[model samples]
Target: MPHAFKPGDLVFAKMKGYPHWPARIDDIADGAVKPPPNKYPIFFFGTHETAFLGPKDLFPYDKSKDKYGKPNKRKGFNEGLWEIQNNPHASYS
Candidate 1:
């Protein structure tokens, strides 16, 4: 009936310190796409890869920023792939 995350919607997950990176919602608990590999399900920039924090761990990817209070907006498409900077450890410099 209700779900916090939907497949393909990007959300911030605190994978390591606070927020690792933006990740797309793979699946919800009741099966929106396909249930995560394990019991807990987290979003992903990688694989909707599992989280290292909370099940309540989530932040909307819209108007997303880095750990610092700065604009971490997507700069360019680069060569082919997206240049959203998957590195949470690094900032747009």
Candidate 2:
């Protein structure tokens, strides 16, 4: 099952290459669009993927845009597209 996280929920996500990175849920697009098989809704974050350090090399958040603030669709893979995972510190928090 997919993890249902809410905005402002502090969570941790593991990238294809990165191990674990501290991230806060910025937004939830619930069923806004269909993702690949086994994939769920996309999650947006204030931080970029590339910001992960050490065993982490996730993709960075692309801020490129036009003067009108329109996102540059030409860019590939955004930082907001994260895979959900259980927060390791959930018990402590």
Candidate 3:
């Protein structure tokens, strides 16, 4: 079967070294690896890290019913500044 998410959709993804985290879909397609049939490209929310993951590793992020929890205040503040200065799609228009 095909993947359930599309580009620009928000989701939660499970990857090694981190908890299941909030992410925004970048695209879905085959990657350098082929074991999972297809790969999902995502931008992690708090850290804005990019990853190409598999379907079994991802799920929908229901903001109305789900909570991603709080980030460390200091780290959150630093990341927010980094995002504001560097991320092309931050709060600005």
Worst 10 residues of 3 by lDDT: 63-72
Q: What is candidate 3's lDDT per residue for 1-93, written digit by digit as tens?
A: 545677766566677866666566674346543224477666676566677887677776654214443343533334533443356244321
Residue range with the least summed lDDT across 10 consecutive positions in model 2: 60-69
The 0-to-1 C-alpha lDDT of every candidate, in the order given, reads 0.43, 0.32, 0.57
Instruction: Write model 2 residue lDDT over 1-93, tens digit each, in one string.
Output: 533443444444446653333444343247654444433222323234222222132222222111112222322223322222233122222
Which residue pairs of candidate 3 clash?
A: none
State which candidate, 1 or 3, has the greater lDDT. 3
The list of candidate 3 runs beyond 4 A from truth reads: 1-3, 27-37, 63-93
Q: Mind sharing the TM-score for model 1?
A: 0.41
Q: Which residue runs of candidate 2 sit more than 4 Å off their true CA positions?
A: 1-3, 28-47, 50-93
Instruction: Write the residue-wise lDDT of candidate 1 on 41-87 in tens digits.
Output: 55444332454334466665654444422334433212111323445
lDDT comparing candidate 1 with the true structure: 0.43
